RNA sequence: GUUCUUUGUAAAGUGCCUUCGAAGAGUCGAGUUGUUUGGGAAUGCAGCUCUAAGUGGGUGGUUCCAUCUAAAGCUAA
RNA sequence: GUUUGACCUCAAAUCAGGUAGGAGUACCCGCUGAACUUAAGCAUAUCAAUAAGCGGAGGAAAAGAAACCAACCGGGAUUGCCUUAGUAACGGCGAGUGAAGCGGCAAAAGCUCAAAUUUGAAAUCUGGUACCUUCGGUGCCCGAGUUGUAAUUUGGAGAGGG
């Protein structure tokens, strides 16, 4: 596959250790940013499509407005704990249900909320 | 001899509008209320000018005066937002509707006498957009109508309504005849 | 609301009224100029729900395009509408486009309304919902293809039928036909 | 020349009757504002020979 | 196991909005009937639905089309013929 | 019948929040000393102007 | 380059810039308490770790409570207007507590509240008031 | 961290109960001609004849089923 | 009314102030665009949706929160890297062209209008003037706007009340 004027684009990824202490540094500033809270949001437990892949269990964008309700908070509310909401996720495993709603049960409790003011 | 390309172009855009034949829907302006009703319902109209700018603020402030220093009944006035009185008609809410035969974009209220006639709630048509205007403190308004008539107006509203009717709805119930605008 | 009438009553092109009215518009636009301002937008509906505010600083202008294309069998896949929106704002460079709609046809000439907003005035200066358009990332949409009719043309849209240009061609060309090589060769 | 070729495409079996109906300063604008076939141009354009 | 968590978009395909209906009888009276239409319901006063739907078919890009223009030109006349 | 139902709301049976609104607005103003009242304006077209 | 090698000639100088140190060692400035705590010697996991904040929540790629005790601490460390007031004193003083015949006073009830809202009002202005 | 103001019968947050229920047209789409993609399913676009409905429409798949709501717009890494 | 005035359209000011050309051009967004060369000589093909040319932007740009991907115990903005893969697919299966779901990681932010009446008060905003605690704020005035500017709202619903 060289019919093409490829020498005229290589592109070597000399850059790799620059690259990765770039991305440390950002995520040092944003921590120093966000010191109070975690760099990632709380994301779900989800899983996988494709049959070749469903035996593993994997992160997911956001929990469902179902989830959310069920853990005894707001979907306008969690997003301001740093909980991720989806809104077009529909929840199809009573399973996968229970351990979402756990976890955000779990989360509600190791975390601690300053004072609005 | 020559004159201005735009004073040419509305002079031959009024002769091809005589001389093109025009749909049934079309051609229903222009059949408007005669001199005399369409003077009344002015005159009627004339007595429930919505308050103006000036006016608004010398009230408001009057009563910011008179609370400073330590239960009026509801306002009357005419309704002549085009939405407001679309809005209005179709609910069964207004008495009288009044539609500009000069509205510039024609389609924009094609269906306005229709919709009314549909509805029931009297309607009629005079000529000029302008005048509608004039009596709302706007420059154009291409609609008007009353909703809350003071009950000393209720018995000359129900009379203009009633001569309203004959004079337009049975006079030019016939409006969808052969397409107008057949002028040699 | 009496757009909703509006609007199906737009829907009915073929309808003997909007003929009457497209066959006297065409007309009233072939006497004018190519390209001349008008002062109030013929379909409101359309308009309104492109964007459009009557509030000082958006202007609305109509311009006339040729239609039609083995000599002339050359497809020069550049749209009428995308040239009409590049002359228009070229015309009115210190204008941004917005969108445009069409309105009218005919058999030799095309016919389409586009609305502008002026980034100088303080009112959309100050206006949260239309500062936007005042960045210089914005400035002549139209010539970059940024319209709705722009991004029509260049394919941009989810889905596997627009995997070529699902991010531009050239970027997906360019990103694809060059070969990566790492430090660590795998 | 539109005309020729819906004649010539009458003169087949392709369509028939049926399928065909399926001021003067603005008279020349109206009179000044579909597909063809290279069969019925040349045809119009050897019958145009004096 | 199923959980029927809760409705979407696709679940507002309720009634017709009957205001939306209205409206669209209004424009459909007050707009009249295009240069196609006029030739079908011309053709269903004598020759029935069957020119017609043939005629719609030509004219759109399928026959589902074809059949609701048709139900629609019939409902149409029998208003007319009668109110 | 009207095509919707639409129910009434409080505000058509109430006197306007924004006629109250700009009235208090206006109240404060003239406490903070930045609109004269139209009664000193008035007593000024007297007392000035000589 | 063109311009480049002119600038060097030039005697205009450069606009000389030295910041790449202070582009790693970055002072926090989200916290009081934190900043009095954290040392930068450690990086912002370790940090974290020592003092107990979890610094990520989905699990990291590759292998790896005083402090809290204060966040916790920090946990630990509107009257009606004139006009309101005189209103809700006429209320009271001409109805008392018939919220019924209150909800039906045309004259004093121009708004036409409900006598859930008129009965939480009164309770409000009787707490701050006689 | 310290301090001046608020306010006006003003704006928002959750549960329950009562009454209602607006979504983008010369647009999707069809045939023609050119171009282009691995896109054989005709992949996208453009010029042209015609012109779609709201218990509708688009894209897929074993008698039907699975997923979204285009034809308006903004957005930091 | 043999008149005067309302509008709608169209004119000119060295009217008051703003905006545009152009330059640079590695990267970005569109239009236009070949040949030498490679093949079974060759029109399909390859060179190439490249070279050059034109127009429009910034530190990045485009795109971006599905009329998506999938057929599962289903995933849930776009973008970037390994893999998927030199596989599917295309090409006189001829030289050759050639992807995408999923999987591992970086980053993760959602949203704003149209369409239901503020209708018990166009409550919206530019401009000119006098002041001030001058990246702007207040009073006053002509105007833009009712052919729709304010508030709320986009199915994640939503709206009128208790």
Same mark, same amino acid.
């Given at each position: ?44 437990? *989800? ?71 | ?47 429930? $000018? ?135 | ?6 609007? @199906? ?37 359309? &308009? ?8 000082? /600083?958006? *202007?609305?202008?109509?311009? $006339? ?16 509408? &995308? ?75 989810? /889905? ?8 531009? %061609? %050239? ?11 790492? $430090?660590? +060769?795998? | ?50 | ?35 196609? @239409? ?6 269903? %006063? ?38 | ?30 406490? @903070? ?12 077209? @007297?007392?000035?102007?000589? | ?15 000389? $810039? %030295?910041?790449?140190?202070?582009? +790693? ?106």
């Amino acid at each position: 596959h060289f019919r093409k004027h490829w020498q005229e684009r290589v592109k070597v990824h000399f850059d790799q250790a620059g690259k990765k202490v770039s991305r440390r540094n950002a995520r040092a500033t944003r921590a120093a940013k966000i010191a109070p809270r975690p760099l990632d949001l709380l994301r779900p437990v *989800v899983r996988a499509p494709t049959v070749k892949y469903n035996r593993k269990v994997r992160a997911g964008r956001g929990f469902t407005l179902a989830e959310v309700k069920a853990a005894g908070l707001t979907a306008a509310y969690a997003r301001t704990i740093g909980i991720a909401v989806d809104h077009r996720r529909q929840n199809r495993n009573q399973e996968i249900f229970d351990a979402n709603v756990q976890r955000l049960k779990e989360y509600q409790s190791k975390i601690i909320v300053f004072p609005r003011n | 001899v020559k004159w201005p390309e735009y004073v040419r172009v509305q002079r031959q855009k009024k002769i091809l509008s005589i001389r093109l034949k025009v749909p049934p829907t079309i051609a229903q302006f222009q059949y408007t209320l005669d001199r005399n009703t369409a003077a009344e319902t002015f005159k009627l109209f004339n007595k429930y $000018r919505p308050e103006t700018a000036a006016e608004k603020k010398e009230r408001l402030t009057k009563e910011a005066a008179a609370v400073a220093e330590g239960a009026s009944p509801k306002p009357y006035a005419v309704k002549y937002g085009l939405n407001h009185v679309v809005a209005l008609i179709e609910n069964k809410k207004a008495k009288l509707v009044l539609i500009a035969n000069d509205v510039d974009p024609i389609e924009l209220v094609v269906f306005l006498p229709a919709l009314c006639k549909k509805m029931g709630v009297p309607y009629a048509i005079v000529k000029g957009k302008a005048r509608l205007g004039t009596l709302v403190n706007q420059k154009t308004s291409a609609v008007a109508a009353l909703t809350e008539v003071r009950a000393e107006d209720e018995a000359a509203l129900a009379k203009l309504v009633s001569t309203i009717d004959a004079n337009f709805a049975d006079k030019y119930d016939e409006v969808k005849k052969h397409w107008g605008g057949g002028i040699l | 609301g009496a757009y909703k009438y509006l609007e @199906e009553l737009q829907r009915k092109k073929q309808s003997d009224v909007l003929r009457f009215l497209q066959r006297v518009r065409v007309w009233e636009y072939r006497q004018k100029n190519v390209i001349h301002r008008a002062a109030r937008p013929t379909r409101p509906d359309k &308009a309104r729900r492109l964007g459009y505010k009557a509030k000082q /600083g958006f *202007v609305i202008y109509r311009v $006339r395009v040729r239609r039609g294309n083995g000599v002339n069998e050359l497809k020069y896949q550049r749209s009428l509408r &995308a040239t009409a929106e590049e002359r228009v704002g070229r015309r009115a460079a210190n204008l941004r486009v917005l969108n445009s709609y069409w309105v009218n046809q005919d058999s030799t000439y095309k016919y389409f309304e586009v609305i502008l907003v002026d980034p100088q005035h303080k009112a959309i200066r100050r206006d949260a919902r239309y500062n936007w358009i005042c960045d210089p990332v914005h400035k002549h949409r139209e010539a970059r293809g940024l319209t709705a009719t722009g991004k029509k043309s260049r394919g941009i849209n989810k /889905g596997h039928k627009f995997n070529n240009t699902k991010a531009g %061609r %050239r970027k997906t060309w360019k990103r694809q036909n060059t070969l990566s090589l790492w $430090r660590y +060769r795998k | 020349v539109e005309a020729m070729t819906l004649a010539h495409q009458l003169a087949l079996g392709q369509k028939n009757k049926h399928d065909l109906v399926d001021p003067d300063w603005f008279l020349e604008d109206e009179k000044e504002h579909k597909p063809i076939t290279k069969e019925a141009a040349m045809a119009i354009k050897e019958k145009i020979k004096a | 196991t199923s959980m029927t968590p809760a409705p979407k978009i696709s679940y507002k395909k309720g009634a017709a909005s009957n205001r939306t209906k209205f409206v669209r009888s209004l424009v459909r009276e007050i707009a009249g009937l295009s240069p196609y @239409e006029r030739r079908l319901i011309d053709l269903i %006063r004598n020759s029935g639905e069957k020119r017609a739907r043939k005629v719609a078919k030509k004219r759109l890009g399928s026959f589902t089309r074809a059949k609701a223009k048709v139900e629609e030109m019939n409902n149409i006349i029998a208003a007319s013929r009668r109110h | 019948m009207p095509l919707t139902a639409v129910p009434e709301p409080k505000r058509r049976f109430v006197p306007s929040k924004n006629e109250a609104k700009r009235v208090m607005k206006i109240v404060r103003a003239i406490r @903070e000393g930045r609109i004269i009242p139209p009664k000193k304006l008035k007593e000024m077209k @007297e007392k000035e102007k000589i | 380059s063109v311009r480049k090698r002119k600038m060097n000639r030039s005697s205009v100088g450069k606009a000389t $810039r %030295r910041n790449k140190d202070k582009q +790693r060692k970055i002072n926090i400035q989200s916290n009081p308490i934190i900043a009095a705590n954290w040392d930068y010697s450690l990086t912002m996991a370790q940090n974290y770790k020592k003092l107990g904040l979890r610094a990520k929540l989905q699990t990291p790629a590759g292998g790896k409570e005083t402090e809290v005790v204060k966040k916790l601490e920090e946990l630990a460390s509107r009257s009606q207007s004139e006009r309101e007031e005189e209103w809700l004193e006429k209320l009271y003083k001409k109805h008392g507590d018939d919220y019924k015949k209150m909800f039906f006073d045309k004259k004093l009830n121009i708004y036409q509240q409900s006598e859930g809202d008129l009965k939480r009002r009164l309770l409000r202005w009787k707490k701050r008031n006689g």
